[PDB]
């Protein structure tokens with residue numbers, strides 16, 4: 001079942017990528033850069049999840065299955081999602097690449113701490129987990145603080161859209177570390193199959209859902 | 224022999240890099256960025272192939288993983304060089320350029336995974352790599368060539384020449400891979416080794432000689 | 444002792460990062476990018492050295508390889524060179540080609556170091572030598588074309604660039620010297636001796652350099 005679920009996921013990623021490509025052909029004032037980002041996210045995730053479906057992107061460690069392909073996915077997909085969110089805030093105004101790369105750095109660090117934590121045992125695991133959570137809190141502070149102020153500097157209509165997609169992504173963000181801690185990688189309260197379904201369903205909303213909402217909102221700003 | 228061949232290769236890469244540096248001192252209207260790219264490609268490949276010559280860049284079928292370490296950097300830089308050639312004298316399209324870099328990096332990764340795989344799984348990864356290559360070719364002779372044409376007859380003529388040069392070499396690599404030990408195993412290991420010594424000399428050094436000379440000639 | 448030393452180091456990095464953040468709040472004409480770089484260096488190094496303190500960022504090869512050092516340097520050292528390059532270009536046109544030239548040389552340098560540490564006999568010193576050649580080219584650029592960029596940006600800027608260039612160059616030569624003398628090389632210096640050198644040097648490079656660098660640029664501020 002775990003294999004079939006990942007095959008299905010990869011197919012939905014492919015469909016998502018194709019949809020964003022078709023949208024890119026009639027861009028409606030959205031720069032090609034934002035369509036490229038929207039396409040890379042699902043395609044990369046799709047490839048990583050295909051490796052799990054083929055039984056390659058996981059191994060046995062500490063007597064538990066480590067789905068290391070998820071970290072290979074996130075280390076690329078999650079910084080790109082933040083870039084998408086940051087460019088949305090900056091839409092119709094001057095770019096702040098310093099702030100954007102601040103978010104990219106925090107996010108990449110976050111995913112790494114996750115991988116190291118999953119390879120770790122006892123107190124050491126939760127030291128790395130904790131550092132990852134601290135990174136996430138700082139990302140959230142930026143998202144609803146200085147990055148939202150950039151959105152507001154670009155007018156009521158843009159700011160309204162940014163706030164919507166900021167809440168969408170932020171809601172999904174907090175789910176991942178919550179599921180991680182509850183699941184076999186952490187306290188082990190949640191069954192392996194339960195975790196697998198969570199990390200199949202969440203990513204469909206993040207890797208495809210977010211960009212549908214994001215791109216449509218920006219396209220609607222077009223006359 | 225395999226060791227000696229790789230030593231020789233690395234020395235040719237060094238000579239190539241030195242030639243591009245000398246050219247960079249009298250640039251003839253070519254931006255320093257295009258000389259830097261031309262220098263990094265051979266130097267990086269040289270270092271990777273030196274690891275094979277020293278018997279480090281392989282594990283034992285025998286997997287020459289040092290080739291993937293090479294290509295994951297050298298091949299995206301070659302595509303960047305080709306993209307900047309198309310855009311020479313006009314506005315840059317960094318979105319298209321990074322589109323090609325992304326496709327190429329994915330391509331080389333699929334190759335590495337395929338080499339570590341067995342049976343149907345190997346050819347699923349290989350196939351994904353081929354699909355990436357087809358999309359790169361479509362871009363090269365489609366939208367990227369249109370950018371070249373927008374930059375005048377002389378530039379377009381040069382771009383088309385280097386596009387065909389690189390495209391010819393591109394298709395050779397996955398063909399040799401499939402035929403060789405990593406794939407169907409029809410071609411002998413020594414034959415594959417020579418192919419992945421000779422091809423790269425034309426790609427890592429040859430391409431930039433043709434590319435840079437063609438662009439320098441546009442100064443006159 | 445080696446574990447405790449690394450814990451202490453990581454704490455000093457954290458303090459350094461916080462200091463640069465506070466400086467960033469009252470920037471005094473220094474762009475946010477240079478504060479971001481100053482913060483990432485110590486935080487990344489701190490995290491890498493924490494992995495050694497927890498006994499994760501090293502393994503046996505008979506002899507002990509502190510591979511977390513290379514994970515640190517491959518990110519921290521190119522960022523230091525970027526900081527130095529942006530200092531030269533302060534108040535003037537940027538040369539990102541030269542900047543990325545230095546990044547490329549530096550990344551190659553650190554890789555040769557790692558490969559050398561994994562190597563034995565003649566092979567080790569071939570890799571080391573290639574790393575030293577990279578360093579020589581970095582020094583030539585630093586006191587050659589990059590210094591000429593500094594000079595083009597006025598007396599006061601050039602004077603500051605020269606001072607931080609000499610500061611960093613002095614530290615640069617120390618690393619490959621300590622490497623060669625220590626267990627990774629000739630093995631003249633004891634393991635504990637090397638560990639202390641690669642704890643003290645980095646405090647001057649990862650925190651010291653940015654203190655001198657940022658203060659010098661902030662002093663140039665009018666009002």
Ligand SMILES: CCCCCCCC/C=C\CCCCCCCC(=O)O
Nearest residue numbers: 095096097098101105108109476483
């Ligand atoms: C965890 C390691 C990841 C580190 C990668 C990012 C490091 C940050 C480095 C440089 C910041 C780049 C800022 C670009 C400035 C452009 C000007 C602007 O628009 O603000």
